[PDB]
């Protein structure tokens, strides 16, 4: 009918952009992740990727290279990279993973 | 290294990780994208999401900054951020800062 099939990448990026949009809309500006907003993301999902969702605030200060406490899309985005890393980088390391 | 099944956002990273892998593996260098692996992604996939796949090598040199003429798994990643962002952004203002 209608709802034109986007490409695999387009789709996959839209999929994270929408999730971003919701988690960005929670508090101040559907445009930045605030810290509580961020903590909600790691608390709500991230079951097996980024364990120690407690020490988020460290990660936040790392993603937010400027430490302005607006994690803009591009700053927040960092997380998705690290996620995409952790898939294999369970360590790198010792007592790693096959 | 390797290998575990996951949740939703975890799927969205996996679904780009597979794409990454399928290109990364080409030459091989099953880690780093050469500019007949990289350029192939822009040529093949995009197709609408972003634009100026002609001056790919602009992006390449901007992405590549560790100077090893090989888009490593976390140079390459940058592009996914930009094309993600491009759903919003025009190339409004160019990304540069030290
Ligand atoms: Ca917000
Ligand atoms: Ca910021
Ligand atoms: Ca390669
Ligand atoms: Ca490089």
- Residue A7: list chain B partners with CB under 8 A: 45-49
In the block, residue with structure tokens 């001056």: B55
Q: For chain A, give the DSSP string.
A: -------HHHHHHHHHHHHHHHHHHSSS-TTEE-HHHHHHHHHHS-SSSS--SSTHHHHHHHHSTT--S-EEHHHHHHHHHHHHHHTT-S-SSSS---
Q: Hey, what are B59's tokens?
A: 């992006």
Domain boundaries of chain B, sorted by first residue: 1-98
- Eight-state DSSP code of residue B58: H
What is the CATH superfamily name and number for domain B1-98?
EF-hand (1.10.238.10)
Among left, alpha and beta (phi > 0; psi -120 to 50; other), residue B9 is alpha
| Residue A7 sits at the chain B interface (C-beta within 8 Å) | yes
Which technique?
Answer: NMR
Q: Hey, what are A71's tokens?
A: 């994690």
A64 assigned binding-site residue: yes
């Amino acid at each position: 009918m209608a709802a034109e099939p986007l490409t695999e990448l387009e789709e996959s990026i839209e999929t994270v952009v929408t999730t971003f949009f919701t988690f960005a809309r929670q508090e101040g500006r559907k445009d930045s992740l605030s810290v509580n907003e961020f903590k909600e993301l790691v608390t709500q999902q991230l079951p097996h990727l980024l364990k120690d969702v407690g020490s988020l605030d460290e990660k936040m200060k790392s993603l937010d290279v400027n430490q302005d406490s607006e994690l803009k899309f591009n700053e927040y985005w960092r997380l998705i990279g690290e996620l995409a890393k952790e898939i294999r980088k369970k360590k790198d390391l010792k007592i790693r993973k096959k």
